[PDB]
């Protein structure tokens, strides 16, 4: 969930 | 690769790193003499179970925070699937922040910078997980007695994250790859600054993989007692690693 948005 | 390609990589790898260590070296060694009052010590102690683990569980979120951003930086970790960067961070950002926790620890009085000043193990007494608490303390005390530079624990919190044995990892030939540049960029650069007898002083991976696990444990403990705190209060992408 949120390790997704900070490596897009 | 050849002689210039691995010192390439050593000064990319220690500019990665400069860029997302969170805090200058200097500035914790500049606040060595800010130490909690007895005061608030006691303060400290006298606070919930609950506020105090609520807090542990931001600070360690904002240090994984510039893991993430290191590893973003890091050369090849982009290159790897979006699967393998999720896993080796899953794994490995808790292990770069124990490693880089040694930069905020003082091995003159034992103490470690903590909201703004340093204080002593007995500040962290109302979370209720005293053995963990002295495990993190010996290690960062074994880490400091090896005097690392920044340059080193750069090229070592690299290796941290990028172990190409991590379960659940789809391209582990591609992340053995990586790796082993990685190891040849510290190696060389432990060789050429005469520095290869810390070596043998590194930590066992078992040690880091034992204080992780250590960290889990208690975590869980105190879900099973304040189900809605960490629910409604603690940081999502500290449940998303740890719960
Ligand atoms: C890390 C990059 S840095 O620039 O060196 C830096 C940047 C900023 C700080 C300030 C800081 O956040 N200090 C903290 N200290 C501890 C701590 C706590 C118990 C013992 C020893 C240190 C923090 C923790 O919450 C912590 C850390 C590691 C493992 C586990 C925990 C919490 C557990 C007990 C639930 S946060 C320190 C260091």
């Known amino acids: 969930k949120i390790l997704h948005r900070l490596l897009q | 690769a050849s002689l210039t390609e691995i010192e390439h990589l ?34 400290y102690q006298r606070k919930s179970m ?20 290191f590893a973003k930086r890091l050369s090849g970790f982009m290159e790897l699937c979006q699967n393998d960067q999720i896993v080796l ?9 124990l490693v880089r926790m040694c930069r905020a620890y003082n091995a003159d009085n034992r103490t470690v910078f903590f909201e703004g000043k340093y204080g002593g193990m007995e500040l962290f007494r109302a979370l209720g997980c005293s053995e963990l608490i002295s495990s993190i303390f010996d290690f960062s005390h074994s880490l400091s007695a090896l005097h690392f530079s920044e340059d080193e624990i750069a090229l070592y919190t690299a290796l941290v994250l990028i172990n190409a044995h991590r ?6 030939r591609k992340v053995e790859q990586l790796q082993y540049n990685l190891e040849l960029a510290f190696h060389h650069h432990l060789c050429k600054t005469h520095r290869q007898s810390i070596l043998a002083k590194l930590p066992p991976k078992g ?37």
Request: neutral net charge.
């Open chain 2, 10 to 43: 050593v000064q990319s790898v220690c500019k990665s790193y400069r860029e997302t260590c969170q805090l200058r070296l200097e500035d914790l060694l500049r606040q060595r003499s800010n130490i909690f009052s007895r005061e608030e010590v006691t303060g």
């Open chain 2, 167 to 172: 379960p659940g990892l789809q391209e582990k």
């Open chain 2, 89 to 97: 961070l899953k794994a490995g950002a808790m292990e770069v922040v």
């Open chain 2, 207 to 243: 040690k880091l993989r034992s204080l992780c696990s250590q960290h889990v444990e208690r975590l869980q403990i105190f879900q099973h007692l304040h189900p809605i705190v960490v629910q409604a209060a603690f940081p999502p992408l500290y449940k998303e690693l740890f719960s």
């Open chain 2, 50 to 69: 609950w506020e105090m683990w609520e807090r542990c569980a931001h600070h360690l979120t904002e240090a994984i925070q510039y893991v993430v951003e």
